[PDB]
Coordinates of C-alpha atoms and ligand atoms in Angstrom, one line a residue:
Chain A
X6 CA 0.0 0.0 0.0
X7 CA 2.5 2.3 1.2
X8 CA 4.1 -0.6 2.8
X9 CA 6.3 -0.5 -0.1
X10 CA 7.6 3.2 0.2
X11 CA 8.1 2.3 3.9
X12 CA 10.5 -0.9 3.0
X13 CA 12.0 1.5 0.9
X14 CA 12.3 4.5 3.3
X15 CA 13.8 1.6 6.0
X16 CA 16.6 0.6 3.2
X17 CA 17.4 4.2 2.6
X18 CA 17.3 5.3 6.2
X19 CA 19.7 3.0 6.9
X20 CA 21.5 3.6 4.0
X21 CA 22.0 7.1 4.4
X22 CA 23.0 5.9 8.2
X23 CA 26.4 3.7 6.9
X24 CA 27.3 7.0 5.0
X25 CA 26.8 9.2 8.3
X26 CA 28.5 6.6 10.3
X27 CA 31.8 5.7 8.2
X28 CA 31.9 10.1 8.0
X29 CA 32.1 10.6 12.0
X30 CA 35.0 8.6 12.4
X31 CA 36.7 11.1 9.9
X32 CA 37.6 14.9 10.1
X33 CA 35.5 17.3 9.4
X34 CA 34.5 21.1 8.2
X35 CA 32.5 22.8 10.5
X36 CA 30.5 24.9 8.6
X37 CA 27.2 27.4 10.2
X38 CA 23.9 28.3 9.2
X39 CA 22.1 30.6 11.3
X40 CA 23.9 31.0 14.2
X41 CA 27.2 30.2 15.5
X42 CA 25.8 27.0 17.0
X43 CA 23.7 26.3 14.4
X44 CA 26.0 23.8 12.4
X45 CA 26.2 21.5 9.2
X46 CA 28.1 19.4 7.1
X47 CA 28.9 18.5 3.9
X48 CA 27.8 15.0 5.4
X49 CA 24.0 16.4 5.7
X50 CA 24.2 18.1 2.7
X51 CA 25.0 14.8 0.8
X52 CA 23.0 12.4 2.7
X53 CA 19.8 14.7 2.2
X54 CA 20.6 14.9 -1.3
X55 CA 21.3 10.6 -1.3
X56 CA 17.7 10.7 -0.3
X57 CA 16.2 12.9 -2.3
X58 CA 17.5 11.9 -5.5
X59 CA 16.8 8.2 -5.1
X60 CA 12.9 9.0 -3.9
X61 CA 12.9 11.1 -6.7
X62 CA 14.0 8.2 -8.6
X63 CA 11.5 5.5 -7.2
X64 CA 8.4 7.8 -6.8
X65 CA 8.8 10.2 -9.3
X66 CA 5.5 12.6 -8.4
X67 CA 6.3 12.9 -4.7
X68 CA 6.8 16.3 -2.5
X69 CA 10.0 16.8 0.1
X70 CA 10.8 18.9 2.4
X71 CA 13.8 18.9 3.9
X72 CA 16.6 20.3 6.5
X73 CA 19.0 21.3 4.5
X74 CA 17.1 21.9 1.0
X75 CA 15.1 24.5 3.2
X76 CA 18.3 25.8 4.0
X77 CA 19.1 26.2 -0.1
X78 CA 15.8 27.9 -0.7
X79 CA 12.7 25.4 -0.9
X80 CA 9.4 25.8 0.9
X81 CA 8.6 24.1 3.7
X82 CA 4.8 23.6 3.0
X83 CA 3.1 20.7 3.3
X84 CA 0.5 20.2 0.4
X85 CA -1.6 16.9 0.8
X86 CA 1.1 14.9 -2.4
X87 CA 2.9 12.3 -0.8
X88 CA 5.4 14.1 1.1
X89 CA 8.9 13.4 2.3
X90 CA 9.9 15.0 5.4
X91 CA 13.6 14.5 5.8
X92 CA 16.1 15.4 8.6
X93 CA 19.6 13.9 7.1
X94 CA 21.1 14.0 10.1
X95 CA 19.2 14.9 13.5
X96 CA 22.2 15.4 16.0
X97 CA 24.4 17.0 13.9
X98 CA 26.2 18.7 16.7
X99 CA 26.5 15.3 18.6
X100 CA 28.1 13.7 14.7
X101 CA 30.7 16.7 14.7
X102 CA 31.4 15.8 18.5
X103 CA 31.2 12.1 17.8
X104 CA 28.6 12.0 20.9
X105 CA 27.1 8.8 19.6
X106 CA 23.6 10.0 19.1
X107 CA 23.0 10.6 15.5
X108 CA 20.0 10.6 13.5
X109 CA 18.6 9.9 9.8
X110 CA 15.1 11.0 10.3
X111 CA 12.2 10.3 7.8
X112 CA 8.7 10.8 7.7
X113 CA 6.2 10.4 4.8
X114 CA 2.9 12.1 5.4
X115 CA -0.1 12.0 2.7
X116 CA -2.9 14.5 2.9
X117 CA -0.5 16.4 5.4
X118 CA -1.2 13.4 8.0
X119 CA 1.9 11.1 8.6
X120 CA 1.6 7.7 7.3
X121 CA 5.0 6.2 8.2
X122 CA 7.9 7.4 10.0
X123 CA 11.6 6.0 10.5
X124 CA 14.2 7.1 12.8
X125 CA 17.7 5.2 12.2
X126 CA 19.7 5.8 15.1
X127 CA 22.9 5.0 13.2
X128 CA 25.9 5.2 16.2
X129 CA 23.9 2.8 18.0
X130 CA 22.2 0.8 15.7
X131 CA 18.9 1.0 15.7
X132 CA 16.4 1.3 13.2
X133 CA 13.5 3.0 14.9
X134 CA 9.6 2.5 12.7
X135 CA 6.4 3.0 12.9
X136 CA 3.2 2.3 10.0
X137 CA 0.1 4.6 11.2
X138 CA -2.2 1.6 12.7
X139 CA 0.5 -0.6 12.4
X140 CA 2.6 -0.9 15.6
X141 CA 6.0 1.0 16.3
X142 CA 9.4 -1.3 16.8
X143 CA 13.2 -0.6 17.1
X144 CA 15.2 -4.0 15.5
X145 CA 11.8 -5.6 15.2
X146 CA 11.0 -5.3 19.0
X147 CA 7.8 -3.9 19.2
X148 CA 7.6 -0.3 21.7
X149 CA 5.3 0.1 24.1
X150 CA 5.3 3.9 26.0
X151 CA 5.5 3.7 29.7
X152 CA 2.0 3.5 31.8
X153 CA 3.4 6.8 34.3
X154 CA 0.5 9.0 34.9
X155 CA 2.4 10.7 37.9
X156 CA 4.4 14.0 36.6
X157 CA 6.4 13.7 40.1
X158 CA 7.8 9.9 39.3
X159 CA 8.1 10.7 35.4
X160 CA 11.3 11.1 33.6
X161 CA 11.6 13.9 31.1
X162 CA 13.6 14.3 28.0
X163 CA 14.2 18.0 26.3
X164 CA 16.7 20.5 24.6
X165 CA 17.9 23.7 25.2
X166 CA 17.7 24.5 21.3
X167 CA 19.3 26.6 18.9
X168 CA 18.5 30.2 20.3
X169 CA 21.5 31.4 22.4
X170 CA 19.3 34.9 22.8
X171 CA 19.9 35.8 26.4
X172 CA 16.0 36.0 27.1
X173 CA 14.8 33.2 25.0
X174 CA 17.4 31.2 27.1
X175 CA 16.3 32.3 30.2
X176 CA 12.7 31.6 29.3
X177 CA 13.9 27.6 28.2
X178 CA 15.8 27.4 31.5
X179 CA 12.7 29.1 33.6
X180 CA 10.3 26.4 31.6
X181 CA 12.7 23.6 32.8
X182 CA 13.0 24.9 36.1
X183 CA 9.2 24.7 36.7
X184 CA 9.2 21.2 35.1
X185 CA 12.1 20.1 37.3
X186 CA 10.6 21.8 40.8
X187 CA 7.6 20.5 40.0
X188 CA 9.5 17.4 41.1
X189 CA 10.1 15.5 38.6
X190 CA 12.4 12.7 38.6
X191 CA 14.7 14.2 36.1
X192 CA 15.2 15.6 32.4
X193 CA 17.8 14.4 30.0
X194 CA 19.0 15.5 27.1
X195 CA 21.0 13.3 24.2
X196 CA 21.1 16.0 21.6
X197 CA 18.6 15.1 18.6
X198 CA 14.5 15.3 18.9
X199 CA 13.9 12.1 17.0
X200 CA 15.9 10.0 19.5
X201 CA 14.5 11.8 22.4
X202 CA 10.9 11.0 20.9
X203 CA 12.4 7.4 20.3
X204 CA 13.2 7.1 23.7
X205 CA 9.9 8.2 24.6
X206 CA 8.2 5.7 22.6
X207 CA 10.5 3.0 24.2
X208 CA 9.1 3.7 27.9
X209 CA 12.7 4.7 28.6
X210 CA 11.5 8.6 29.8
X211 CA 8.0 9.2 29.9
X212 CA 7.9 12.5 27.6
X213 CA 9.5 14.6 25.3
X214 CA 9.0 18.4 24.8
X215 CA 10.9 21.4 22.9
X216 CA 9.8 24.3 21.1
X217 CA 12.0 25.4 18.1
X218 CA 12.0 22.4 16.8
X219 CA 11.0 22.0 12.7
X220 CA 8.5 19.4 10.8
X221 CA 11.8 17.4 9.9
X222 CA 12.8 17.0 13.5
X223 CA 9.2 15.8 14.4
X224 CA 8.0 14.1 10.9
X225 CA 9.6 10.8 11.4
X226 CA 9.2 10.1 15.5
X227 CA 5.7 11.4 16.0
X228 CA 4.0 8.3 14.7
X229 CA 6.4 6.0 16.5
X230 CA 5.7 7.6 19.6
X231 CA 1.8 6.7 18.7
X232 CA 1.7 4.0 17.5
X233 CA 3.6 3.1 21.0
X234 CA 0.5 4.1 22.0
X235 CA 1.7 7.8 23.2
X236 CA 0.2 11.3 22.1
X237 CA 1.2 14.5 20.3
X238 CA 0.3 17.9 21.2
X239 CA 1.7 21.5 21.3
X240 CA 3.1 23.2 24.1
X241 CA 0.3 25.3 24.1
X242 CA -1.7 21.9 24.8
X243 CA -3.5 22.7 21.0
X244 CA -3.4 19.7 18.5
X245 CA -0.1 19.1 17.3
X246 CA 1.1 20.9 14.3
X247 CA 4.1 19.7 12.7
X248 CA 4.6 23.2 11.5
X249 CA 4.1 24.9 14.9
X250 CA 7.8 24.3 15.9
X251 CA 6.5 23.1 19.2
X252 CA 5.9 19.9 20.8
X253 CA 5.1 17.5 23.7
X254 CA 6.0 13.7 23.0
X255 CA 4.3 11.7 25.6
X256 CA 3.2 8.3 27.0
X257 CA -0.4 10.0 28.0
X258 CA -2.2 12.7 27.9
X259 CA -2.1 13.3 31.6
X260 CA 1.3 13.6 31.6
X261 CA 1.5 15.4 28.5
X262 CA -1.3 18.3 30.0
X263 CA 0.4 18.2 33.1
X264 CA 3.4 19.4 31.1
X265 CA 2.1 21.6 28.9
X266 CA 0.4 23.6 32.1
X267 CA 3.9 24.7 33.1
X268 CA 5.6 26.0 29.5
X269 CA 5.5 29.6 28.8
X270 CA 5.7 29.6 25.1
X271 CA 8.1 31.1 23.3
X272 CA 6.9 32.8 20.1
X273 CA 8.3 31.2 17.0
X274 CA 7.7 31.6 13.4
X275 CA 5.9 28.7 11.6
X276 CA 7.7 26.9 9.1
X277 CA 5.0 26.9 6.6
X278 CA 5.0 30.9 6.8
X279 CA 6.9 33.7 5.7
Chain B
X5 CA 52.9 -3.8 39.4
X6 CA 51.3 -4.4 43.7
X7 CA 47.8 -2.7 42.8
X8 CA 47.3 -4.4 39.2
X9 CA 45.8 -7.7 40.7
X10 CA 43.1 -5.1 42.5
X11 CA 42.5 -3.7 39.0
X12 CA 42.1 -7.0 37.6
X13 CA 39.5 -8.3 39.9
X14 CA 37.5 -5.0 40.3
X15 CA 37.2 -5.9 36.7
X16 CA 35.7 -9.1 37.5
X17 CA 33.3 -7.7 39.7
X18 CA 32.3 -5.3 37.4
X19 CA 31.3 -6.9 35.0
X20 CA 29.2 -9.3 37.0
X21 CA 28.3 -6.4 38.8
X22 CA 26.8 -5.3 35.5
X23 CA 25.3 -8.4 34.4
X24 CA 23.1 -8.6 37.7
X25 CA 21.6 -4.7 36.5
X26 CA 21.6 -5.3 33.3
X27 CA 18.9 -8.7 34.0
X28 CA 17.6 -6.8 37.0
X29 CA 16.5 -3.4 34.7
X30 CA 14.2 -5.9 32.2
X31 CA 12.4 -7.1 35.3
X32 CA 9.9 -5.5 38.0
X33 CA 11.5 -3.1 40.6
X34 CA 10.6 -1.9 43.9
X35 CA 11.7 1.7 44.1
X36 CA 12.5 3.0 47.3
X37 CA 13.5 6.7 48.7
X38 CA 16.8 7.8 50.6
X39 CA 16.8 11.4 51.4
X40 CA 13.9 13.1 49.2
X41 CA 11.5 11.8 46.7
X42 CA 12.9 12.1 44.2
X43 CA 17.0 10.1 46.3
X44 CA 15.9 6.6 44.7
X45 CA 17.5 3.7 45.2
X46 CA 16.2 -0.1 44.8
X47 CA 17.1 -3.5 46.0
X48 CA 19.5 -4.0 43.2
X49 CA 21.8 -1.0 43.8
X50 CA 21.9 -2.5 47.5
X51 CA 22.5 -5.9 46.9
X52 CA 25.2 -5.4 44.0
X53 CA 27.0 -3.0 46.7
X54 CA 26.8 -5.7 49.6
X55 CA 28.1 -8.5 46.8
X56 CA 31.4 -6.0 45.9
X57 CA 32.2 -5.2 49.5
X58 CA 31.8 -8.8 50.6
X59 CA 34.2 -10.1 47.6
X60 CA 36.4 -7.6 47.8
X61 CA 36.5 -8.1 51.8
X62 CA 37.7 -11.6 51.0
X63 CA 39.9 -11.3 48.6
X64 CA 41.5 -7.9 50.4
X65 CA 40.3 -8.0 54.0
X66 CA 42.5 -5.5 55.5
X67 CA 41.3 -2.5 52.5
X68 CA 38.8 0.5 53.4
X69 CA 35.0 1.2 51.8
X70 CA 33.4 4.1 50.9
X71 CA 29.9 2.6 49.2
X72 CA 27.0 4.7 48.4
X73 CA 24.0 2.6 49.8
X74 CA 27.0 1.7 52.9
X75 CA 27.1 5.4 53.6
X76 CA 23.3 5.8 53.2
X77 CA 23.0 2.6 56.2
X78 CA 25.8 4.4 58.3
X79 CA 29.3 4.0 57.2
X80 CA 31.8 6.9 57.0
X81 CA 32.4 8.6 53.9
X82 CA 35.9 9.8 54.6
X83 CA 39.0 8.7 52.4
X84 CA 41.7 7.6 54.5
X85 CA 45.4 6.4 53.4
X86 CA 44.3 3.3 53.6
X87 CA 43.5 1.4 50.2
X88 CA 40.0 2.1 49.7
X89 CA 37.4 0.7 47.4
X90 CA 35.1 3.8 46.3
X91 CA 32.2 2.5 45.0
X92 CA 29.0 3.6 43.5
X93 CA 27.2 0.0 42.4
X94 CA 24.5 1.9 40.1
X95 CA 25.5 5.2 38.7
X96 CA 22.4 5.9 37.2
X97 CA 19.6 4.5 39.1
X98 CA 16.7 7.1 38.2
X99 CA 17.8 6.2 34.6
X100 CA 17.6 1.9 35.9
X101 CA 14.3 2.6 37.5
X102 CA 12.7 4.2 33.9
X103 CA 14.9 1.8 31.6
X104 CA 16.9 5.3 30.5
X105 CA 19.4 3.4 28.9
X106 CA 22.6 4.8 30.7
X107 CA 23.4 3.0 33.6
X108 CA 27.0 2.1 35.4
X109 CA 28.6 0.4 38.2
X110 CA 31.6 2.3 38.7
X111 CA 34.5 1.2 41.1
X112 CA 37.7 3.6 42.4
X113 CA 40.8 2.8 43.8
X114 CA 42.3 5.2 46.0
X115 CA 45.7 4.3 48.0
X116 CA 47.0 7.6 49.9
X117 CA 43.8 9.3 48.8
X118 CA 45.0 9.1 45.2
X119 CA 43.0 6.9 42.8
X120 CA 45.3 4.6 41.8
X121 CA 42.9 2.7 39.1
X122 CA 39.2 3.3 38.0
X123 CA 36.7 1.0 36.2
X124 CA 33.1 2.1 34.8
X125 CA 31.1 -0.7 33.2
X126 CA 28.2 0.9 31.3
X127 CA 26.2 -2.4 31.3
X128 CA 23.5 -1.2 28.7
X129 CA 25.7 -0.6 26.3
X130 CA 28.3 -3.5 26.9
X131 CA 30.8 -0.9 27.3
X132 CA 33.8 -1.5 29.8
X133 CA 36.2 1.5 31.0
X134 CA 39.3 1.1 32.7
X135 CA 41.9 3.3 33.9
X136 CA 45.1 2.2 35.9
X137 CA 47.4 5.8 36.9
X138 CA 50.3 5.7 34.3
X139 CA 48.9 3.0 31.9
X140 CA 46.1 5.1 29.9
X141 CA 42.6 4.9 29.5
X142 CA 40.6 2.2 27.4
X143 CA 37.3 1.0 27.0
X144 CA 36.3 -2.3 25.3
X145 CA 40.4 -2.7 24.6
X146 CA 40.1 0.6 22.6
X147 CA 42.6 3.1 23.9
X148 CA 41.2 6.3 24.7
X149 CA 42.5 9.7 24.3
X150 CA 40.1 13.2 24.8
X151 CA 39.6 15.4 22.3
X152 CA 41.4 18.3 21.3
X153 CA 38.8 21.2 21.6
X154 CA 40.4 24.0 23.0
X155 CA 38.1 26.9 21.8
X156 CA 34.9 27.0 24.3
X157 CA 32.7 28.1 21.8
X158 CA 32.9 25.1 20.0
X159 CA 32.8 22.5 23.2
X160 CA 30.4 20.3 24.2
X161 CA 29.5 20.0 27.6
X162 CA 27.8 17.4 30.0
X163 CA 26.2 17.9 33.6
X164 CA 23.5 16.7 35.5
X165 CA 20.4 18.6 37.3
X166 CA 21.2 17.2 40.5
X167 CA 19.0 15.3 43.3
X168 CA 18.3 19.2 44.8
X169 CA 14.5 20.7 43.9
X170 CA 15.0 23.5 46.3
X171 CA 14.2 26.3 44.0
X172 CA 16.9 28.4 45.0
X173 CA 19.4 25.8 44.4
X174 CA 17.6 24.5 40.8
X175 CA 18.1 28.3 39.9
X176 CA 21.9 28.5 40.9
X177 CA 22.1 25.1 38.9
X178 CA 20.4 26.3 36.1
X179 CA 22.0 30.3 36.4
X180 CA 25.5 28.5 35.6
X181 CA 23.9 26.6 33.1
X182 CA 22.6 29.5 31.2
X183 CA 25.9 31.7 32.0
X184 CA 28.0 28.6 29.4
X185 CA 25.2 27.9 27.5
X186 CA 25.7 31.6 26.7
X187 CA 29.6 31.8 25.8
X188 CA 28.5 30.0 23.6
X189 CA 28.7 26.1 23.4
X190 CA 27.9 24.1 20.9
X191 CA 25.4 22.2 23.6
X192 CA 24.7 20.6 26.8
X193 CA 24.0 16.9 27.1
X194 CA 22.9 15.0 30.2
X195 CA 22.5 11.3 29.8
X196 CA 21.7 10.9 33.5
X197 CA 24.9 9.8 35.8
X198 CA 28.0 11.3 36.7
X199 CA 30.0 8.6 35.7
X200 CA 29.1 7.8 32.0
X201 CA 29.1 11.2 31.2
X202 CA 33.0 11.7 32.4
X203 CA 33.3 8.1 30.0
X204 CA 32.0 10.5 27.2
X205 CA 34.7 13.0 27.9
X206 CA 37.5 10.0 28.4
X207 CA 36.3 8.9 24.8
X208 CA 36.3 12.6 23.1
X209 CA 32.6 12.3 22.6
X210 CA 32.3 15.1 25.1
X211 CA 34.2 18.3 25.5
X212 CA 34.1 18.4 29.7
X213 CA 31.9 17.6 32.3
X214 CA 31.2 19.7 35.4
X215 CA 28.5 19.5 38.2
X216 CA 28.5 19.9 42.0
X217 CA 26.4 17.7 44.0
X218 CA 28.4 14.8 43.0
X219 CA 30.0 12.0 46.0
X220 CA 33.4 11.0 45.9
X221 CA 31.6 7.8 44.4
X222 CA 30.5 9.3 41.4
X223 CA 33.8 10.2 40.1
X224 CA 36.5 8.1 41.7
X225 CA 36.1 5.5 39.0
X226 CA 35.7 7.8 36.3
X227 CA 37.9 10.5 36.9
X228 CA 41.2 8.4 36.3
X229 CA 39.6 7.5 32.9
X230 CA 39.2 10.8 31.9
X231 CA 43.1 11.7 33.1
X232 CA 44.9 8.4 32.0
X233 CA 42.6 9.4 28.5
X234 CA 44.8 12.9 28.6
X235 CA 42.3 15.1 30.2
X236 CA 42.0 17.2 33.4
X237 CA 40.5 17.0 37.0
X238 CA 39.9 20.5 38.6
X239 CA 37.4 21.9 41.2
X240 CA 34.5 24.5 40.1
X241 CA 36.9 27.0 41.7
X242 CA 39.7 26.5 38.9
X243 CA 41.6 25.0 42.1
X244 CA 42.4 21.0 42.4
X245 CA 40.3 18.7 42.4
X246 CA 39.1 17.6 45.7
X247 CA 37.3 14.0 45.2
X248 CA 35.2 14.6 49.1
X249 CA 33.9 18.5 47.6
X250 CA 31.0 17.0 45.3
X251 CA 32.0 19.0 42.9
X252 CA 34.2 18.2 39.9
X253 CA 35.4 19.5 36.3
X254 CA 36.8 16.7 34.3
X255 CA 37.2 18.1 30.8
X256 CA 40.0 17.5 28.1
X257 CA 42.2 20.2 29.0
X258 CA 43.3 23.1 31.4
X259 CA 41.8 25.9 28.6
X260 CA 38.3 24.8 28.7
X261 CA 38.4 23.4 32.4
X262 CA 39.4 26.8 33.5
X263 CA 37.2 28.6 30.9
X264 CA 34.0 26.8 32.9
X265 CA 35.4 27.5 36.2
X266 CA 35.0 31.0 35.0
X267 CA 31.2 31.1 34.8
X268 CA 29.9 28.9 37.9
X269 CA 28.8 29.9 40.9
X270 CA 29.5 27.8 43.8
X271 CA 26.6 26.1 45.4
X272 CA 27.2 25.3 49.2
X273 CA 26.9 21.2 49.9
X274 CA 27.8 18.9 53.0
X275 CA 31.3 17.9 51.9
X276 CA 32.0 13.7 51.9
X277 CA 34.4 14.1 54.6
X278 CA 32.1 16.4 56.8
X279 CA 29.0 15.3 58.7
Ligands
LIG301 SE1 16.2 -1.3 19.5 C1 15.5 -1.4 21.3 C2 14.9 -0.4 22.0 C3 14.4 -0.6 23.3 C4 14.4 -1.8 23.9 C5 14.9 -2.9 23.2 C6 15.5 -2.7 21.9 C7 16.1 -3.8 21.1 O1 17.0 -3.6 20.4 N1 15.5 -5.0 21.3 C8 16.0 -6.2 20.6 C9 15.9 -6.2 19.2 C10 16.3 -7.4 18.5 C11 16.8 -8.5 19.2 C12 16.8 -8.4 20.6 C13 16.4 -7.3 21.3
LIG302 O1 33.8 -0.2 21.6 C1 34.7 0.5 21.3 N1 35.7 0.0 20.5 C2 35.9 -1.3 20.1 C3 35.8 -1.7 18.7 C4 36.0 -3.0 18.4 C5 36.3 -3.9 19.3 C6 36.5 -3.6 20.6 C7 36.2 -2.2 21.0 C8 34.8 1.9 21.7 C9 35.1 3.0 20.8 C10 35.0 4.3 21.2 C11 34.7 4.6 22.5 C12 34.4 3.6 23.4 C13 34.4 2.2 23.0 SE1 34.0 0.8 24.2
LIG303 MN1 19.8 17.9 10.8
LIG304 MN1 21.8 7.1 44.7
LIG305 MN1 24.3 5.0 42.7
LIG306 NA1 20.9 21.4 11.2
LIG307 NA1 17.0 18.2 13.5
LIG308 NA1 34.0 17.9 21.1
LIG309 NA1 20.2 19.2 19.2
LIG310 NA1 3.2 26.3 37.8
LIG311 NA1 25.9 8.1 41.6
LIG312 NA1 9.5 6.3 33.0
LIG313 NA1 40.0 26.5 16.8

């Protein structure tokens, strides 16, 4: 059905993972985009280009959006055409550090709903997936998110983002602070959204949350975390909107409510807007 | 070499150490509470500390302990001269109680209050560190060695929140957060115990690694690794490092070390050797 663009997708993703992972052994330019923490490589920049040329190849009248061709120009709208949403590599401060969490992140939506996502966690290993009604696995072991309904025994993951702005820092700090006091049992952070939603979907933290994130960071992990049988929303606690550049990733939505009750949001332009 | 055979059995109990957490963490836990809600500790942190002491009591009867569940039953948590096994038996056990797959038993070695060897097995991840002093750092047989970041701006840093959720506390923790978060970095990572993420700076993974709250437990094991890897030990103040301060910069060199001294702000803690 679209079980064949998802065998595809798991191929590719784990394709475009052996090219990130024989590059982070080697030297590297550092290059920036919009900030000086904001970085890339010629390793995204080929990767995303790997992928886009051989789904160009296979499905011929399919949409992409992705990191880095954003970054050369494209749109980032998401008309209802069988869509690509591609994050080469989520983590790529972690693959210029070699911290070993590093990302190829796909997701393929149709009628701007996502159909199938795949995360390939390529340092580690593991192939993350998920088919909408379909179950979500890492290396075939089917996920399940925890059962936590209690904020002050939950274990939260989360970023401090790309923003080194003094008061959009402090207002990320303040929002963790409130989480953290509330108590929780603790907030981690491994560097990359999709593996933080992964881990989410595994039951190893109990949710996820970040605003600044884009559709490519969220595209390909949202529907494992649900089909793990764990919900999407904004910060805000609206629907999720994978172009809202917010999000809360979590095994319920008590949790997730309970979360969203303490973020201030931080205003952030839409990436399907000018 | 009169301390190797020590090295060579902490080893050993390592890594069964590790392979009793690493069935345990599949399995049903009770989770119990030490000093706060929030302090957690569960049989399995207790019983592999009560199997290292007691084989290491055999084998070396006349050595010292300093053992984070021993302390929390009683013991003293002062470093004598004596040889003294410093361990913590799960360095991560908030990660162990949510299946956050970072979790360690680390083992120090200190003769003469100096570490003389240090071994972290990271039992999710199969992943074996040892240090002896003079003999370099090595993980899985691979020899370590830091990296070579000296420019701050383009480090990566790991800490932890800490087991404090007194607000004024959480808000000097987070002030000296926001302070190098500002220089800038490149980022912040926490995976969730002290001693993995000093591993990440042995391996070059990781720029430096600073937090205060830590036990000497914490970082005996670790902070050989990141030394015999090439990196640095200092205290928050830029001083020495004192392993019974809970606090502790272990980063790849002087430059950045000092460079994070620069931007934290001391927060005031019972000392390991103070009561
Ligand atoms: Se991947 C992953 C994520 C969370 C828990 C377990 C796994 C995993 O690899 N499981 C597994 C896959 C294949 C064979 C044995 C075990
Ligand atoms: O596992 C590692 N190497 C390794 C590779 C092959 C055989 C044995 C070991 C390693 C690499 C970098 C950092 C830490 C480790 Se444990
Ligand atoms: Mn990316
Ligand atoms: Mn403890
Ligand atoms: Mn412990
Ligand atoms: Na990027
Ligand atoms: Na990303
Ligand atoms: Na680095
Ligand atoms: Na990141
Ligand atoms: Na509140
Ligand atoms: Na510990
Ligand atoms: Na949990
Ligand atoms: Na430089």
């Amino acid at each position: 059905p679209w079980q064949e663009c998802m065998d595809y997708a798991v191929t590719l993703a784990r394709q475009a993972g052996e090219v990130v992972c024989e590059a982070i052994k080697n030297e590297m330019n550092v290059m920036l985009k919009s900030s000086p923490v904001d970085l890339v490589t010629a390793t995204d920049q080929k990767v995303e280009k790997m992928l886009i040329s051989s789904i160009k190849e296979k499905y011929p009248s399919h949409s992409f959006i992705g990191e880095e061709s954003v970054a050369a120009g494209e749109k980032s709208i998401l008309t209802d055409n069988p869509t690509w949403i591609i994050d080469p590599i989520d983590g790529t401060t972690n693959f210029v550090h070699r911290f070993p969490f590093v990302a190829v992140s796909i997701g393929f939506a149709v009628n701007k709903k996502i159909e199938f996502g795949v995360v390939y966690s390529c340092v580690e290993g593991k192939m993350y997936t998920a088919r909408k009604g379909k179950g979500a696995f890492c290396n075939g072991q089917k996920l399940q998110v925890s059962q936590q309904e209690d904020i002050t025994k939950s274990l939260l993951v989360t970023e401090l983002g790309s923003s080194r702005t003094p008061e959009t820092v402090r207002m990320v700090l303040s929002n963790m602070e409130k989480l953290f006091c509330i108590p929780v049992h603790g907030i981690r952070s491994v560097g990359t959204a999709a593996v933080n939603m992964c881990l989410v979907a595994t039951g190893g933290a109990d949710a996820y949350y970040e605003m600044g994130i884009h559709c490519w960071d969220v595209a390909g992990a949202g529907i494992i975390v649900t089909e793990a049988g764990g919900v999407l929303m904004d910060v805000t606690g609206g629907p999720f909107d994978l172009m809202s550049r917010r999000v809360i990733a979590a095994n319920n939505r008590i949790l997730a409510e309970r979360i969203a009750k303490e973020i201030q949001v931080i205003p952030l332009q839409r990436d399907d807007e000018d």
